[PDB]
């Protein structure tokens, strides 16, 4: 289906603990593929997937330079933010950024994102039109005014419409065995008696990609999404995901309860109750 | 922030290469725009983001620079490029340059000094305006001194300057001396001394009240 590639930037000021820390993580769909951390023995961008190791020295040199310059430019961005908000250099603040592009089955651009946040709050975003800027406070208004007085959104649109989808398509083609394959979850039901008249029935889904999934407990057909304990989807650590859903039921009503799973890697919705 | 544009003004011939420099007090990254101003016409943004050419602007225009020092270059100067140029930074606040005036180079020409006394109707209206025209000369730099009965006078004077004549690339100037009827009538001889770069001595044109 439609796929996506994003990049996340994290800049943390730490007065007295050194210079601000800069971290970059690159994602294609729900797979992290590259990493940067300014607090390493050797500050360098490094791959995190088998299909990006294939690339050549020029790529890694480019990315590492793009991150080593990013470190200092965001160390100055934090100073400019402290200036904008009249804050203390002795405080610890965070600048975040997420940007990337989605593509459809034809491989052409669908939507491109570029959002910046300060201290967990939305700071400034690029709109879908790839030309205007949305500021959330009167301090981001300075940034937006100087950013459109130089027509920087032109450069942003050029990259998103250009190099973004180009490279993204390259990554999908290089790893079609992992990124474009759908691996269905492995599911089972586990009963756990809490008392003599109450048992917890749990639907377990193990090892699936991507993270999107739905797990519901239905009684003889009727959807009871009200008495279901759900856990936020959790990475397994091997680039797959895990998720369970539980319902407390009286002893004997174990047959009326059935489990309906919904994954993209599932040709048809799986129905189960054991 | 203060941005300094240099030169303040200059004379250039057709086809010449012209470079205008704008220096900032601190690193402004790439936040600089260049604007053209031709008398009466809506300002034209030539270069934005310090080094990107606005679509449609002639390719002879180029923008360069970084940090604190930027510049705009015209590879081959045309006649329809003469005006006042401005640099604008938008890193901190919005501040403009001092402005640079692009003008025509030509041969040095001496001014034509013509001095006229007050007209009769004006003397019957109570006033008396003695006028001095300094016609077609070059360069723009010119000084004028009114002299009444041999003593220099600077009170009640009016000065008007002409732009570069599109025909012969020269300048002109008008200097009026306004007095009252009785003020004018209590004096003799009205001299209009002129000082130009073409002459070491002042061109002196005067008239008696006879």
């Amino acid at each position: 289906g439609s796929h996506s590639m994003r990049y996340f930037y994290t800049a943390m000021s730490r007065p007295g603990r050194g210079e601000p820390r800069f971290i970059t993580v690159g994602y294609v769909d729900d797979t992290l593929f590259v990493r940067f951390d300014s607090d390493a023995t050797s500050p360098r961008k490094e791959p995190r997937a088998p299909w990006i190791e294939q690339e050549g020295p020029e790529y890694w040199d480019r990315e590492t330079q793009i991150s080593k310059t990013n470190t200092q430019t965001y160390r100055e961005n934090l100073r400019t933010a402290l200036r904008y908000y009249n804050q203390s250099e002795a405080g610890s603040h965070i600048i975040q950024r997420m940007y990337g592009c989605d593509v459809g089955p034809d491989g052409r651009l669908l939507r491109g994102y570029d959002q910046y946040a300060y201290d967990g709050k939305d700071y400034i975003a690029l709109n879908e039109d790839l030309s205007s800027w949305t500021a959330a406070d009167t301090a981001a208004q300075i940034t937006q005014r100087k950013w459109e007085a130089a027509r920087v959104a032109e450069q942003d649109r050029a990259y998103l419409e250009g190099l973004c989808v180009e490279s993204l398509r390259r990554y999908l083609e290089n790893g079609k065995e992992t990124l474009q394959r759908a691996d269905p979850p492995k599911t089972h039901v586990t009963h756990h008696p809490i008392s003599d008249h109450e048992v917890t029935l749990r639907c377990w889904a193990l090892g699936f990609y991507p993270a999107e999934i739905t797990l519901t407990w239905q009684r003889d057909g009727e959807d009871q999404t009200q008495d279901t304990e759900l856990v936020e989807t959790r990475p397994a650590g091997d680039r797959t995901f895990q998720k369970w859903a539980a319902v407390v039921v009286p002893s004997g009503e174990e047959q009326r309860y059935t489990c309906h799973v919904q994954h993209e890697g599932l040709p048809k919705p799986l129905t189960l109750r054991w | 922030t203060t941005v300094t544009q240099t030169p303040s003004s200059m004379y250039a011939s057709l086809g010449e290469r012209v470079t205008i420099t704008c220096k900032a007090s601190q690193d402004i990254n790439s936040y600089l725009n260049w604007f053209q101003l031709k008398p009466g016409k809506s300002p034209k943004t030539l270069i934005y983001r310090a080094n990107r050419l606005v679509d449609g602007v002639p390719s002879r225009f180029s923008g360069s620079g970084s940090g604190q020092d930027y510049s705009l270059t015209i590879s081959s100067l045309e006649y329809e490029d003469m005006g006042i140029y401005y640099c604008l930074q938008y890193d901190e606040l919005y501040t403009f340059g001092g402005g640079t005036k692009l003008e025509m180079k030509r041969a040095d020409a001496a001014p034509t000094v013509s001095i006229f006394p007050p007209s009769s109707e004006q003397l019957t209206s109570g006033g008396a305006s003695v006028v001095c025209f300094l016609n077609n000369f070059y360069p723009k730099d010119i000084n004028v001194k009114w002299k009444i009965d041999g003593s220099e006078r600077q009170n009640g004077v009016l000065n008007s300057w002409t732009d570069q004549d599109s025909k012969d690339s020269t300048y002109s100037m008008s200097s009026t001396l306004t007095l009252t009827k009785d003020e004018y009538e209590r004096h003799n001889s009205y001299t209009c001394e002129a000082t130009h770069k073409t002459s070491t001595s002042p061109i002196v044109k005067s008239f008696n009240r006879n």
Binding site: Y7, E63, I66, T73, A81, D156, L163, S167 | -
Partner: peptide, 9 residues
């Protein structure tokens, strides 16, 4: 890949 141009705030 990654946009090699960054814009100060």
């Amino acid at each position: 890949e990654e946009f090699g141009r960054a814009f100060s705030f």
